[PDB]
């Protein structure tokens, strides 16, 4: 007498409220620590609300091997006494055949693709749908929290970026399309993150950022070829060519696009990121504070250069807290 | 009406020489020549989209030679090449090669085997043939119809279509020639003059299959409107207009995921409308229960329906399943015959008994197997016949009349009645008996059979009750006069074991164990195996007494004093009254009604279209034979019989072959019934064999027959569905289209009818059962439409189980 | 020219639509100020519900057919052909997986390869029409190979 | 008795085992009723032994549902195409599986012969001797994947 007809996740409204409207209006993209609203439809009218409410429980699972010890699986009832800080569900509006349920997630939840499952007592588990959980710069309890709304928009929502090239005395701004809200960017980023097997640490922005940076540097080393070849259309085609292997490759003359790709991935996953250019950067020194330059009698360099060189320009900055560090190192 | 021949420029394998070989011919139907030297089956001409598109493309800029004064292939080829050069279709340097190709030897199907076969060929720039460069595609028509001249009108003309591939051509070129006078060319090996010539040459190009192009051209020429237009054509414009009109009425069928014949038959009026559009402008115009109304028409129709299959009725019995069915039906007809003969002898003072009934059953079964239209029917005595015999004997005893002579006169009237019924085709009224009455009667008869089977065991238990003490000195001849220990319990054990073994072997027939051939052999012989096992089990128990089969010592009358083999219609002991001779018609009418209803409903049950009966059944012939044999046997002092429902249904099921669940075929043959009748007649001569067979094994067999006779009845299925949730109902038309409570109300009405019939059976007026059974037909035809819709009645009561 | 389908089937549904389905809109119109007929094929990045369709099913594909009045061009039949092409499963899968007009053209060519043309005949017989069944089965096998 | 108790408390889902009613009340009540069987002599005095024999036969035929050895013995009398989709059929040859089942049948026959002798107290030792057989002789004639498919602790495909 408590069959389930369908479950409307209300992707458009929730994505507009969770600042993921640019991603999609069909798939549910929500950010941790913020409630999202779903509608549950019953095949038959519900006679008594309270026993039926006591008969239903919700389970959220992520990963191939979900478990409670890994914090990848959580079972929570639908009641007003649930921990809104943790996983919880409460009926805000109800009809004879429909329940409007507000579902909350913990502020330190594991990111990735989730499956929402409903359990009725004395009945098999039923899948209600799928949703993707992301970091929440708008949530104060989140580690990626930003104080300013303008900073949040610029460092997460703005897909039109500027990569500054050239010299220190002549800075040439290059228009760049990060495209972190392209349809396949989130899936590609999560599939790349899936190479890391420490899924319990995926709730930590530091671990996710470090893993993504290492993997993207490995992909840049494996995919970037030695030297239109210099025609760029943003970070999304570069990421597609680095992961799938199909598309126009990036050559060594534009190896600086690794920072843009990393910023795109971090912004898509919900980590506030920006691209920073440092002119006259000494690379390849290994910490040494000396650069040796060699010139002939004509004021010219005969060789291709030393290991330690002062590059004309050269990085990704991410905003998060540092719980594992001493106090005072939060920020970029 | 013209003959169109398609030839393709191919090369042989034995000599690698390029030549012309015919590929398909049109006689208003298309036949294709495969790679074996024999033509495929005729079929309608069907064309691909690309073939018609390329045909239109090459026809729009094609070369036409109308009313050409040529009578030889060389002259036609020379004129066509000259007009090709004039119209810039080909280059002047290609004329020699094309003339060489067009004047090659035209081979046919007769010399295909003389060579090493034919291979696709492409004409090259030089005199040597090359191989095609594009991937080869085998013809659909060849793969489909080829993997297995009289109809040509004398005043007809031929059309030759030539297709060839030449890589030295810029674009495909079409050549259309209409001769001034039709002439016979060496290219065509038939004595039909050639009027039209189609030449299609070109290079290898995508979306251009020159075989399909030639097929499209031949299909266009075979159409009557285009043929008339080409005969009346004065320029290429008229031919182009005719081609455009041909394409206007062309119908394209797109590919679909689920091909259904109903959705395909929705195309018929569209094709009719396109045909009407095609011929709106052309001068040509587009091209067993029934009442015959003839005396004895139904009998002749049944004879012509069944007797052509007489040869198959002997050869189809060469299978062990037929022998197993013979063994099954032998017991299933002998045991009720013995029981009914004993009861009749007890009730009628042995005027008719076991021996007379067995002889009558044997004779009638032999004659019905040799001459009947539905040999699967089993002819034997029935319970209502016993009730009528008892009533008639009581009437004759009350009125002091010779009862056997009364039976003689009843049979004499029965012969006249059945002759009158067959003469006017009185068996056409059986078509008004729908699945409703048939299923009600079958379910009632199965319930009666099961009830009698259990009541016999109850009577056995009552005769030998369970008591603490028994008298060890009890006379056994002819029957035990007192209770005996271990008798009823052993009878119950034997019956239960027989039923269990029969059911287990029936399940093993459909099981997945053992090799399939041996599995089917064991399953077919399941009943004989169970009978043999239980008979052997009872055989080793010497001390305990069980009732056995009893047969007469020899072929003799039951009571010699009462009557002999031939009974005088004028009287045996006293002169027969005159008034009774005319008054016997009404009892004869009742007997005819009983036998008619029983036999016709049994024939309806065993000849349902869902049972895969692909040989036909004759109602009139079977009814005439049954009633005539009954009337003849009445003269010899033998009981009249009828087609019993249980025995015939069991015989049909034993001969039914189950596919991989689904009925596949039925072993319809006359050998089984003939052998059963012969064994029934010889049952007296095999007394030692039958004397060791207990009745409990036969009771278990009867229970198995009763529980297996309910498989094909939808009334039993709905009775089972009455105790099921609605979501567990099977996907059937009467559930998915009818509400559950409506179906339950229908089943309840049928249950009420069954209860009324059962109450009628349990009354002294049990001879009125056929009338109450008939009264269900007015119920179905009147009262059910008043409370059920037409669609509901069609779904619930369907003759072939169809969704309206 | 009155439509054959209207004259035949109209001179006398939403439940069977799957819940996880998308809609295709085919628009046909005649404009005399156009030089040649033009086809417009649109596949949306995300399926959306437009005001054009009065059903709660998102629209993924859009067909636009505009052009002047020309012989042998019935825009109602053109829209029917486009809708039949889109309703076919192979072309639908190819259009979902299409990355350029070349793949759509190849799918259309394959669709036309397995198309079956029935020419008009004087005597229509159901036996000769049922001789077409294995040819259609073979064309279906070629389509889904 | 324990297998029958577990099966009686087993709840079957919509074929597939769903849950088992694991509780201490059942065994306690059974022991209490066994102890009180003397005090309910009139009730037990009217219960025939034949009903109990039928119950014992039912228990014996129902205790074979969960044994894969019985399933392979049944498959010995089936065509290869009728074998169910199980890891030990789709990954192991039919004759190899039949040889494994025959080895198990030989072991069963040896145990049955040991039972029918006055030295029937040596049955646990012969039963233990099957473990060295499985751990030594079977790898000598069967591959590791074949043994994992045929002898799986949780019925998994290696
Ligand atoms: C005493 C019997 C002989 C003992 C000698 C022992 C040696 C021995 O018996 O092997 C021969 C034969 C193997 O041959 P094989 O497996 O190919 O035989 C298949 C089997 O008969 C299936 O029943 C058939 O399917 P169906 O039923 O028509 O649907 C199938 O035909 P198809 O449909 O696929 O085309 C047959 O191919 O045995 C068996 O049948 C397997 C069961 C053996 C069980 C153990 C034997 C009881
Ligand atoms: C229905 C069939 C049998 C025919 C109809 C029966 C009637 C019309 C006929 C058939 C045979 C006839 C009988 C034949 C012979 C005799 C002997 C004679 O000395 C007196 C009349 C009598 C007794 C006849 C009476 C009428 C009779 C009974
Ligand atoms: C009488 C015994 C043998 C069988 C009893 C079962 C019958 C009477 C019951 C079982 C299921 C029942 C149906 C279940 C559901 C509905 C839908 C409801 O909106 C109207 C009544 C209706 C259609 C019920 C009618 C009665 C019903 C058919
Ligand atoms: C001994 C009784 C109980 C059962 C007899 C069935 C056994 C012995 C039979 C039935 C099916 C048979 C198999 C059927 C097919 C093949 C394939 C062939 O290339 C090698 C032999 C092999 C693998 C057979 C081995 C023997 C086999 C397993
Ligand atoms: C035979 O008929 C006579 C009467 O004619 C009767 O007395 C006798 O009992 C009958 N025989 C038997 C065996 O019943």
XYZ file of N, CA, C and O and ligand atoms in Angstrom, chain B residues 345 349-351 558-562, ligand 5:
50
model
N -25.606 -56.453 -17.859
C -26.036 -57.823 -17.635
C -26.753 -57.993 -16.310
O -27.743 -58.723 -16.216
N -30.948 -58.582 -16.816
C -31.003 -60.044 -16.723
C -30.167 -60.715 -17.811
O -30.581 -61.714 -18.403
N -28.988 -60.152 -18.079
C -27.989 -60.689 -19.005
C -28.496 -60.771 -20.442
O -27.956 -61.542 -21.241
N -29.526 -59.997 -20.800
C -29.945 -59.932 -22.196
C -28.858 -59.310 -23.064
O -28.594 -59.780 -24.177
N -24.647 -63.676 -23.759
C -24.628 -63.677 -22.299
C -25.704 -64.596 -21.729
O -25.452 -65.337 -20.772
N -26.904 -64.564 -22.304
C -28.004 -65.418 -21.876
C -28.577 -66.116 -23.100
O -29.183 -65.467 -23.961
N -28.382 -67.434 -23.177
C -28.848 -68.186 -24.338
C -30.368 -68.285 -24.366
O -30.976 -68.288 -25.444
N -30.997 -68.378 -23.193
C -32.450 -68.515 -23.135
C -33.149 -67.263 -23.654
O -34.179 -67.353 -24.332
N -32.609 -66.085 -23.335
C -33.278 -64.840 -23.702
C -33.248 -64.604 -25.208
O -34.284 -64.308 -25.814
C -31.660 -65.490 -18.541
O -33.046 -65.166 -18.710
C -33.922 -65.885 -17.830
C -35.332 -65.498 -18.209
O -35.598 -65.779 -19.576
C -33.581 -65.557 -16.379
O -34.406 -66.333 -15.518
C -32.114 -65.855 -16.103
O -31.773 -65.427 -14.788
C -31.221 -65.146 -17.117
N -29.826 -65.495 -16.902
C -29.018 -64.809 -16.087
C -27.610 -65.312 -15.984
O -29.407 -63.830 -15.460
